[PDB]
Amino acid sequence: IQFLRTEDEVVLQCIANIHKEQRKFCLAAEGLGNRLCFLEPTSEAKYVPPDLCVCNFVLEQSLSVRALQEMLANTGHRTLLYGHAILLRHSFSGMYLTCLTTSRSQTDKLAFDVGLRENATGEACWWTIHPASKQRSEGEKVRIGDDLILVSVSSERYLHLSVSNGNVQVDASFMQTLWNVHPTCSGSSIEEGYLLGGHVVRLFHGHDECLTIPSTDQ
Amino acid sequence: VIISTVDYLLRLQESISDFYWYYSGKDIIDESGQHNFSKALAVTKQIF
Amino acid sequence: ELLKELLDLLQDMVVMLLSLLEGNVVNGTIGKQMVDTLVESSTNVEMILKFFDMFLKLKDLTSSDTFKEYDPDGKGIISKKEFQKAMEGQKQYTQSEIDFLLSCAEADENDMFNYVDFVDRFHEPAKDIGFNVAVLLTNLSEHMP
Amino acid sequence: AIRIRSILRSLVPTEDLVGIISIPLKLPSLNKDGSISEPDMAANFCPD
Amino acid sequence: SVVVKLLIRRPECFGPALRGEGGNGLLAAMQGAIKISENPALDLPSQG
């Protein structure tokens, strides 16, 4: 289909104009050792392979704002609508995308860090989707290839790309930035036993031999 | 005109869903909520 | 009154959905889209159907001989404990359904209510609207075989 | 309320408020000739 | 809540100090305003 539903594996892509050339980046993070988010470049994929293992997120829930408030006060597949609050789960680590209260941006004093957190508790992990222009409106279904605006529920801050002397970072700021949501795997298909992209496999030669290298130590 | 009627119906449905989610966690509904609910249901009946 | 207005609005919506299926062919597009819509909201459809099914079983389970033995006087006023024991004895309701039925019944300090008014209040709208729901489901079933 | 107070705390740190409160004022003095030297209150940092 | 939401959606209402990514700060703004008040060339128009 042409609409985003829940339990769908997507990537979040943005465009930065650096040195009069547009460069595309994807939102990525690691699980262990470093919970902060970074941007993985994907424009020069022909020369350097992108690492899209850490760029995948799963759309868990797509609740309404009033429904989110009721769920937080109390405590299958549905199409994402503009004005709804979604929950993003990191596909590799199993953590959730969270607007962190800590900050490290020297340029922007009002910006916050964005990272991964183990549990989805409170408003810090929910993000509201808003249209980028007048062509869309709230209550309309989110289409594949649209430019979205993600606003933190807890801090009321846009997910924003910061450019500083060629350095590219991502933070929760008061300036907006458009994001493209490219689906990598639709959640409707649940067939197993067939080779999908991004799978980790062993290539057995016959029944006992397999493809290996002598040592991990470089 | 048919699509315009559908558009107003969709806006009214979103408003009624918001009102229900306001009243979802409460045991009773007061007189103002019942009055506004009755008005909204009358308008929805006319649109249907 | 609010429940009556909500049920009238539900009947109006089902009448509109039946008017959409007017002159629909076998394996037509509007039938496919209506089946997709009803599948997409199948939990709420099941809730509405369970509501109708409970309040349609309530009429036949309050006219049987066992319930007549539960109220030998025939005045039409029974207590909540006798109604609970009667609906447990018919072996048709589950515990959640009988708890919901006891919650929907308004008692007093004597813990007694007129079950005739209760059944007449909750059964006639069910019989009026569930027929249109059944007509819609039969139409979709026969035109999407 | 917690969200609004968190936004207001993120806007203004305590160090800025304490620094502004700690700013010294210019106040009228008595001259050696016995005159009063009042600074201009419409052009200076004020207690208000 | 409405006013705070409207103010943070348009941060240029906060002035050059609290704009972010270039804003010096509230205390720095107040000290700069004191320096402006000390200099007659900046505080007032040129004579004539």
- The residue of chain D nearest to residue A123, with distances taken between CA atoms, is D3
User: What residues of chain A lie within 8 A of the CB of E5, using their CB?
Assistant: 156
Structure tokens belonging to residue B20: 């229900």
Return the ∠ at Cα D20 (arms to D17 and D24), rounded to 5°: 150
Q: Does A123 touch chain D (CB under 8 A)?
A: yes
Q: What are phi and psi of D25, to 5 degrees?
A: -100, 155
Q: Is D47 exposed, middle or buried (0-12, 13-18, 19+ CB in 10 A)?
A: exposed
Q: How far apart (Å, rounded) are the C-alpha atoms in residues A6 and A67?
A: 16
C75 token code pair? 């005045």
Q: Say how far apart CA C112 and CA A77 lie, in whole Å.
A: 46
CB A24 within 8 A of CB A41: yes
Minimal Cα–Cα distance from E40 to chain A, Å? 32
CB contact under 8 A, E27 and D7: no
Kind and range of the H or E run holding A99: strand A96-99
D7 touches chain E (CB under 8 A): yes
3-state secondary structure at position D17: helix
B residues 9-38 lying closer than 8 A (beta carbon) to C: 29, 34, 37-38
Q: Do D10 and A123 touch (CB under 8 A)?
A: no
Q: How far apart are CA C94 and CA C101, in angstroms?
A: 11
Name the residue among A160, A40, A18 with its Cα closest to residue A103.
A160
Residues in chain A: 218
CB A107 within 8 A of CB A165: no
Residue A186's closest CA among A1, A26, A12? Answer: A1
| Alpha-helical segments (H) within chain A | 65-74
Q: How far apart are CA A143 and CA A146, in angstroms?
A: 6
Minimal CA–CA distance to C139: which of C42, C28, C52, C9?
C28
Residues of A in contact with E25 (CB under 8 A): 109
Distance CA A8, CA C71 (A): 58
Would you say A147 and A156 are in contact if contact means Cβ atoms under 8 Å apart?
Answer: no
User: Would you say A145 and A178 are in contact if contact means Cβ atoms under 8 Å apart?
Assistant: no
Q: Which residues of chain D have a CB within 8 Å of the CB of A154?
A: 3, 6
> What distance in Å separates the CA atoms of residue A61 and residue A44, rounded to the nearest whole number?
33
CA-to-CA distance for A81 and A65, rounded, in angstroms? 11
Q: Are A107 and E22 in contact (CB under 8 A)?
A: yes
Q: Are E26 and D12 in contact (CB under 8 A)?
A: yes
3-state secondary structure of C109: coil
